[PDB]
Design a protein around this nucleic acid. Sequence first.
RNA 1: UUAAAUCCUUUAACGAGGAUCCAUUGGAGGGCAAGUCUGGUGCCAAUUCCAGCUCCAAUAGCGUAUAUUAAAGUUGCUGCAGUUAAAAAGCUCGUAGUUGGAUCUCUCUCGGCCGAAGCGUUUACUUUGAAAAAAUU
RNA 2: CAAGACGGACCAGAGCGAAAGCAUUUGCCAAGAAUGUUUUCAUUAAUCAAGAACGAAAGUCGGAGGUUCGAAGACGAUCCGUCGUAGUUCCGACCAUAAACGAUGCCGACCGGCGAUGCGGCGGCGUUAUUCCCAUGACCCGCCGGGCAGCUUCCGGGAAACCAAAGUCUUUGGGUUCCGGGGGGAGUAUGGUUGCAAAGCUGAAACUUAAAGGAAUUGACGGAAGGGCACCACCAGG
Lengths: 149, 141, 30, 82, 129
Amino acid sequence: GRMHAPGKGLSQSALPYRRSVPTWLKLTSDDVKEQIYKLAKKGLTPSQIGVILRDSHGVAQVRFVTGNKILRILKSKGLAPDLPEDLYHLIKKAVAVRKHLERNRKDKDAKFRLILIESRIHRLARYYKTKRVLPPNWKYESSTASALV
Amino acid sequence: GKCRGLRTARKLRSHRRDQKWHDKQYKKAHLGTALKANPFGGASHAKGIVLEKVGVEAKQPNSAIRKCVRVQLIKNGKKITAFVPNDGCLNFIEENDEVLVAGFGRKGHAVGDIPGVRFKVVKVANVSLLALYKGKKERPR
Amino acid sequence: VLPKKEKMKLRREQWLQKIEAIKLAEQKHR
Amino acid sequence: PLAKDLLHPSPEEEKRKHKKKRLVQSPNSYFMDVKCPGCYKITTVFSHAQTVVLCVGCSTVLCQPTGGKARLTEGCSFRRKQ
Amino acid sequence: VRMNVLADALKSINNAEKRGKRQVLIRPCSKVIVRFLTVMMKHGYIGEFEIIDDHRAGKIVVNLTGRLNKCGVISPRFDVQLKDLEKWQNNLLPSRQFGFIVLTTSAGIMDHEEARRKHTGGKILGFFF
RNA sequence: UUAAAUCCUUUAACGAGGAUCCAUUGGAGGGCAAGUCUGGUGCCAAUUCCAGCUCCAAUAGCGUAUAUUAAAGUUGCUGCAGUUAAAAAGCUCGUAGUUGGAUCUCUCUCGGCCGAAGCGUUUACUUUGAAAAAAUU
RNA sequence: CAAGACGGACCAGAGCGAAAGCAUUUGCCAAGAAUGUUUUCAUUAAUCAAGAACGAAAGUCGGAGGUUCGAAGACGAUCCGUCGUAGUUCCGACCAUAAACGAUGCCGACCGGCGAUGCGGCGGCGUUAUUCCCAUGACCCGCCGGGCAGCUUCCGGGAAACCAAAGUCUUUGGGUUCCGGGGGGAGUAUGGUUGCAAAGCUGAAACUUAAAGGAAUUGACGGAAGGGCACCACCAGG
């Protein structure tokens, strides 16, 4: 079930059993990696890179073709951000909700949802501190939240 | 649902400690204030001085007028009332006598016939009531 | 209907009866 | 009733089931190749694409994203691929 | 959430057996589940099974035969010293002949008779009669 | 016998018909063993109190009181419950503690094939061995 | 003409929200479930002591406004009526309690049928947008997913009412939280703590009692009600 919602939905992606590249795909691994590099230089999150490569160029799975996932490809070249993209999106949402709250003080629903968001932030920050992605002195603070975005 | 981990020993025994405290017998035996409020003082028998003789009325559906003696315990000064087996055995007991008094029988509970009498007289003048009833012994005064 | 005491006795007795029947059936296989 | 081979389901039942709940899960989407009406070029487009797909040479909108399957522009030709 | 997939497998098999089904599907597969099923196979309780291999944790289709009365897990995995083993079967088995404590020992996953022959103890997993 | 004795053991003599050389203690006419009984004493035939007989159980022992244990799965680890019987928190975010999906099939130096040395990631687990007062069981 | 209040009918078998709750149009703001997905991360999760957010109504402290209703109160009758104080309305602080109900923790698995409904998606002839000039909306058929709610059932369970969970339980172990231990004394005394207050949270013992309680099937029963008959009953009469 959902981590803060009462929903329990099944919807997700289902990978096929064939891990082999299809015969009709003529793109080599380095061409796909060059597309990844120019897309990241356009300023795109790895999720957006995967969606664009799936839709327009027909690359179904980047790891099945190149052998590495998008974040590792961007990391080896060095075009990867300091904080991860899910934590970035959560902190951006928390900043937006806090701005809405400072303009609108009666919205107790917005207060409850902000508490939900920053609890999700605390769980993800604990995970990233445990596996050494974030430095151990990193801490999410309310005023420092907009400074990260 | 009860926890069943391999490291839940502390939680299980702490819960059992508290829920032990929620039992009347455990709390009576472990709180100390029952033996600090029992007239016998934890004992099975106690001696006393016969203050007087009183009469207790029995239950409503079967009317009777039973005869008890009000006695004052030696060791702690408490006043209790004690049952006598029949009206004949009341003639062996006098005011200001030494009496040995036991419980009525069911580990501390009252009589199912005579309401609120708790104790029965076993000995008077250091001789038993059973011997005095049967003519086996006489009592001194 | 009937007290739970003899229902428990009947259930455990019939269970031991299946235990004995399967024991004799499995002993017959040797 | 109570007598069927779970190891060998028929194509109609395994097609009918949810994509995760089959014997071995498999997607329902596909990659299909599209010819623009104003040109001849082949574009490989995901069936459930979330991005609007422009022609690399003509810059004509091939498909518009919807809730499920993508909505092709009228005039475009498409073929199932692989 | 889902913890102890062996419990889920054994409950699924027991519920399938009580309805008089012949064939059951088990997800997910595991090494411990396959070893337990092989142990029940060698004693002639659950017939035949086949492992469907997708690129996830797999699934198992088991051919039930009818002899099995109750298969069950024991959670948590209590340590079973070789003396204590005797006590354990008197707690779980309805007789001293049939039924099976399954132990994982350093000599493998096996039943209590074979663990007594190999003279070793281990963690208790279940029982089936 | 023993320090000297007593007791026990061994032996003379005496020692049993009501073999009076006389077994008690409790309970029974609602339920586990055991009653279609009698006689006194009062209320308006039922009915308070008292003495008995008959039967039953254990027996040189048998009642009683109190505590405690077992019955008891009324403390529940094994092994209880929580709609209507005692009982689930107003509701959800909300650290610690408890629990956590699938997966991986021994050698190097110096002395006589061996001994020393690094252990091999650490444990938990299991088996073996030493060692650990008697008395108690 | 004005002031305050409130959004009926449509309005449910509906929907949304963590719960309390939520119904005039329009615009803005920031959230959200489900669905779709050959995106990404790759165990990041489940459950709660501590601590914190929200919490109907009534209530307390400052303001504003006071139409209706209305505790108290003044009158008139004898549970009602006239007038109407505090309040009910808004803003800012508190209080944190309800039959706050499914008198029913949360997360996970397995275990019958049916045809309805809300949202999303997929496939498909047809009718419609005055035969619509292709799509699109509205209907129609079927399937899939997460829902709300039914009917049915020797799955099993229960003391029974009944429950697709209150099942998979003496054949007794998926994970974890709160909590009961006969009836009263008694939510009392005492101490602590929160609150401006009203009160809230925690919470005994002495003693007393043989019960307390839950579920269901039932004869008779002075009577009571619906009808019918009769000039030894009635109306009008002799």
